[PDB]
Design a protein around this ligand. Structure first.
Ligand SMILES: [Co+2]
Lengths: 370, 69, 61, 65, 52
RNA sequence: UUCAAACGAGAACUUUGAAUCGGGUUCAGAUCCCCGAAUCUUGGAAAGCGUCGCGGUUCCGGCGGCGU
RNA sequence: UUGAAAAGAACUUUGAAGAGAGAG
RNA sequence: AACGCAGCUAGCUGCGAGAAUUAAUGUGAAUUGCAGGACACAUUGAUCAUCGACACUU
């Protein structure tokens, strides 16, 4: 077992050749059983026994989360205003590739690195020729994910340079942490939405002499993660009045939380860059040779994971966004264009992937940074 | 199309400025030399093999040659 | 960035056609964005760019 | 499930009537996946679709008479 | 007309036209099939408009 | 008219099976698109068409063997 | 010609739905 | 009289390839179904009205 170099280059598995990877923050489930605590499963009964039955699955999440932690520390180390996010995304992606030692689909990037600026919320990454220099008075949402054998971990944070945004950052961080602690086994999603809205709205923001009230973006919400499936079909809300579905043992969730000094809703603003093949659709005929070729290329290289046009240009494929929209109309791939708020507004996001262990709740994405 | 009947004419019409290419077709019993001109596709047919190669050495340079066989 | 009538009145004839030409060129590109997948921000630009055509063409006329 | 389109295309490609077009009864799924003349040409080479022989009408009875 | 279409595309995108075929769509719009010269290629050109 | 199967929550009625010319090309256009020729033999076998095979399985729209 | 104001019926449940039962 | 013109637009309405409008004057922060676009509001401007300049396809 060796150690990591100052510019992170050693693969995570090389740092832990034993096979066991650092555990996330273990937390007992909330005492939502009418006062009765859940500190009765931590004892090594059959609960722990069947927890051990899925130990190998967890280790993949652990290594992915560790890789995410090192990558985000590296990004925090050198990120600064004045440099465009094309090279920022290139650096983040290449560092993550080296740290995860990607090989086909057994390991690699779960989805393109999102870097949303100002009113933009999510699902934005620069395309080819995108000349956007960063500014001192900017806020950015760095959302990126890594996976091991399809065990996806999703985490996101917000970077700021002007110290006028710390109130909004702390509000969104508190909302995300409250959603984290509120989540548990056999709890309704409407409850977590209740908690998130009741913690996050009780904050006030003073920006540029104007006092705003921070509100959730009712359009976005958290999601459940599946095997090579970023969205398993369950969405945890961040506003009041949602579904009454429960969370069950053995599932993983991404507890996202967005806060804006705007209208609390988002729409499609600029050119789409994120794309995702549908996990549920089967075989749909195609009539264009270029479209067929692009489809088989993407299903070989990106499978069901999300991809961006940069990842296709990185593969040497050109003249392809045509067949790409063709797959979009055919329903094979669903575009995910950037979501943006009103101009002049600001948005902050913090995200963590949580594990519902039989004995406890592990937030594998937890780090010392946040 | 037009049939070139005697050898001397064919290398003349192959030297015209409008001659774009000559295509050589190899059949069981003969070889056909077809030159694509502006208005006609002239064809010269020889029934014996040995003259086919010697004529093949004597096409004007720079004129595109296509071998069907 | 906003084309206004009164500042164009003292401007000379030659570059007014030059100003007209590119505005037509961007208008053509916006129409290309419409038939393909088009951003809403992009789809807002036809009306404003069309009115600048009228604004400029009114000046020369 | 719906093979009306594929029988019309097969007849056009096979240059025969639709009554002479045979669709595989227990392979229906991927003929249903065929929606172009290219895909039809894929199947008739693999034997999933073949041209049924012309109904026999022998002249031997009239020849004997 | 076909002559007017050919001149417009040439000076608009700096290419050469071999022939143009036009028809009037049932909706009332005129559709023109403009074939480029062999030396030019439609792939790289249609990238320049952004259509391809 | 009948039997069986498929899809489907549901089947007498849906689907499948059984009782200025030549050549290619689409889901829908061809004397108009593409290729090639123009205004007994050259065209012409290279095409096309029959069969027998090899590759590939939304990629190869790729290959050959005979015969006309 | 709903209603002062859509506040135009969240959510749970039966049904494939149209349709209901609760709730608001 | 016909045919066209709106980011999403069939009818009604308005308009004419400058095509639900250009210019100018008055007014002075909106239009709105959604989105986008706006918006030092004078180092001068959204909307609306007026309407004398310009333009007005068959
Ligand atoms: Co997420």
């Amino acid at each position: 077992p060796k150690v990591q170099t100052d510019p992170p280059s050693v693969p995570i598995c090389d740092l832990y050749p034993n096979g066991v990877f650092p555990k996330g923050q273990e937390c007992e489930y909330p005492p939502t059983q009418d006062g009765r605590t859940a500190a009765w499963r931590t004892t090594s009964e059959e609960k722990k026994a069947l927890d051990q039955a899925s130990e190998e699955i967890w280790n993949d999440f652990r290594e992915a989360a560790e890789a995410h932690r090192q990558v985000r520390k590296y990004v925090m180390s050198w990120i600064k205003p004045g440099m465009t996010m094309i090279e920022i995304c290139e650096k983040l992606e290449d560092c993550s590739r080296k740290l995860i030692k990607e090989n086909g689909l057994n390991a690699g990037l779960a989805f393109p690195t999102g870097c949303s600026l100002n009113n933009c919320a999510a699902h934005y990454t620069p395309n080819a020729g995108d000349t956007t220099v960063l500014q001192y008075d900017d806020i950015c949402k760095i959302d990126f994910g890594t996976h091991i054998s399809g065990r996806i971990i999703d985490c996101a944070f917000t970077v700021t340079f002007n110290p006028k945004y710390d109130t909004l950052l702390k509000a969104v961080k508190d909302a995300t942490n409250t959603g984290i602690k509120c989540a548990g086994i056999d709890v309704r999603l409407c409850d977590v939405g209740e908690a998130i809205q009741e913690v996050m709205e009780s904050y006030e923001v003073e920006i540029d002499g104007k006092t705003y009230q921070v509100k959730p973006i009712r359009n976005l919400n958290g999601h459940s993660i599946g095997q090579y499936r970023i969205h398993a079909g369950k969405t945890v809300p961040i506003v009041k009045g949602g579904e009454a579905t429960r969370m069950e043992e053995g599932e993983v969730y991404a507890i996202e939380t967005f806060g804006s000094t705007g209208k609390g809703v988002v729409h499609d603003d600029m050119e789409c860059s994120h794309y995702m093949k549908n996990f549920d659709v089967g075989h749909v005929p195609i009539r264009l040779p270029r479209t067929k070729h692009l489809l088989n290329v993407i299903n070989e290289n990106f499978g069901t994971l999300a991809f961006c046009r940069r990842w296709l240009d990185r593969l040497g494929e050109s003249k392809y966004l045509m067949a790409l929209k063709n797959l979009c109309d055919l329903g094979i791939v669903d575009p995910y264009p950037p979501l943006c708020d009103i101009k002049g507004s600001y948005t902050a996001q913090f995200e963590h992937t949580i594990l519902l262990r039989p004995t406890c709740k592990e937030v594998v994405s937890r780090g010392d940074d946040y | 199309p037009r049939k070139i009947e005697e050898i001397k004419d064919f290398l003349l019409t192959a030297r015209r400025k409008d001659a774009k290419s000559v295509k050589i077709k190899k059949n069981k019993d003969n070889v056909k030399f077809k030159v694509r001109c502006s208005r006609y596709l002239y064809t010269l047919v020889i029934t014996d093999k040995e003259k086919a190669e010697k004529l093949k050495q004597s096409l004007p340079p720079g004129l595109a040659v296509k071998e069907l066989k | 960035a906003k084309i206004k009538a009164r500042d164009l009145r003292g401007k000379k004839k030659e570059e007014l056609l030059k100003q007209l030409d590119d505005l037509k060129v961007e208008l053509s590109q916006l129409r290309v964005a419409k038939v393909t997948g088009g951003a809403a921000s992009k789809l807002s630009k036809i009306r404003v760019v069309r009115k600048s055509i009228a604004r400029v063409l009114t000046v020369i006329n | 499930s719906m093979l009306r389109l594929q029988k019309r295309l097969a007849s056009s490609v096979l240059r025969c009537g639709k009554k002479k077009v045979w669709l595989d009864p227990n392979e229906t799924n991927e003929i249903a996946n065929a929606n172009s003349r290219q895909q039809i040409r894929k199947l008739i080479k693999d034997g999933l679709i073949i041209r049924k022989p012309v109904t026999v009408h022998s002249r031997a009875r009239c020849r004997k008479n | 007309n076909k002559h007017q279409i050919k001149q417009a595309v040439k000076k608009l995108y700096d290419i050469d036209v071999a022939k143009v075929n036009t028809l009037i769509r049932p909706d009332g719009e005129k559709k023109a099939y403009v074939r480029l010269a062999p030396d030019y290629d439609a792939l790289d050109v249609a990238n320049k408009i952004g259509i391809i």
